[PDB]
Amino acid sequence: DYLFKVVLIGDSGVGKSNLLSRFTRNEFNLESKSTIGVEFATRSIQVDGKTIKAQIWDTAGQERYRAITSAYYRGAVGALLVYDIAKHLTYENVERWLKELRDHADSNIVIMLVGNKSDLRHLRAVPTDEARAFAEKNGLSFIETSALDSTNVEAAFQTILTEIY
Ligand SMILES: Nc1nc2c(ncn2[C@@H]2O[C@H](COP(=O)(O)OP(=O)(O)O)[C@@H](O)[C@H]2O)c(=O)[nH]1
Numbered sequence: 001d002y003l004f005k006v007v008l009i010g011d012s013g014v015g016k017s018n019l020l021s022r023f024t025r026n027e028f029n030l031e032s033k034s035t036i037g038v039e040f041a042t043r044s045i046q047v048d049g050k051t052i053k054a055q056i057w058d059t060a061g062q063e064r065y066r067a068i069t070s071a072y073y074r075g076a077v078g079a080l081l082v083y084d085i086a087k088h089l090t091y092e093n094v095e096r097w098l099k100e101l102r103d104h105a106d107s108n109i110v111i112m113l114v115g116n117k118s119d120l121r122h123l124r125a126v127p128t129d130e131a132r133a134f135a136e137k138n139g140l141s142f143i144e145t146s147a148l149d150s151t152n153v154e155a156a157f158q159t160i161l162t163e164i165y
Helices: 016-025 066-073 088-092 094-104 128-138 153-164
Strands: 003-009 038-047 050-059 076-084 110-116 141-144
Touching: 003 016, 003 094, 003 153, 016 038, 016 050, 016 076, 016 110, 016 153, 038 066, 038 153, 050 153, 066 094, 076 088, 076 094, 076 153, 088 094, 094 110, 110 128, 110 153, 128 141, 141 153
Parallel strands: 003 050, 003 076, 076 110, 110 141
Antiparallel strands: 038 050
């Protein structure tokens, strides 16, 4: 009975924890209940008429010691690389996360670029187009999600799990 390991990465405050709670329990929390360290939780999904088990990992990013960083990426078959569409700096940091994946993760890890906080359209600072072309260029999948209103959260996880299984 195998649990596919999928890691969340991206700047602190982008809603990674909320994506986790959406995917595992379909919950949202305005007051962040983000891990102070590393956390994981499990989900069962029907992909291609089959049952797939996934463990989604999340990190505060407060610990950089080599043993935990190696442990976080060890065995990961998928990564959701998350930014906040209302913060250009989070989008700029995606290259840093892409680099971290190359440095510590399996070279064949499937990567999905996720623009979270789609609900805040008025405060948008990252055009869909730009992000999309970056993704295409770097060989990533791309989706915009809202943890708050649940838009595309399941779809995001489904897509990655389809390539992983
Ligand atoms: N408007 C909006 N806020 C969100 C969304 N996802 C998370 N947040 C909020 O952004 C803040 C940080 O989210 P959190 O999940 O803790 O970020 P993390 O550091 O990446 O885990 C929290 O106050 C969340 O309620 C979203 O999709 N839309």
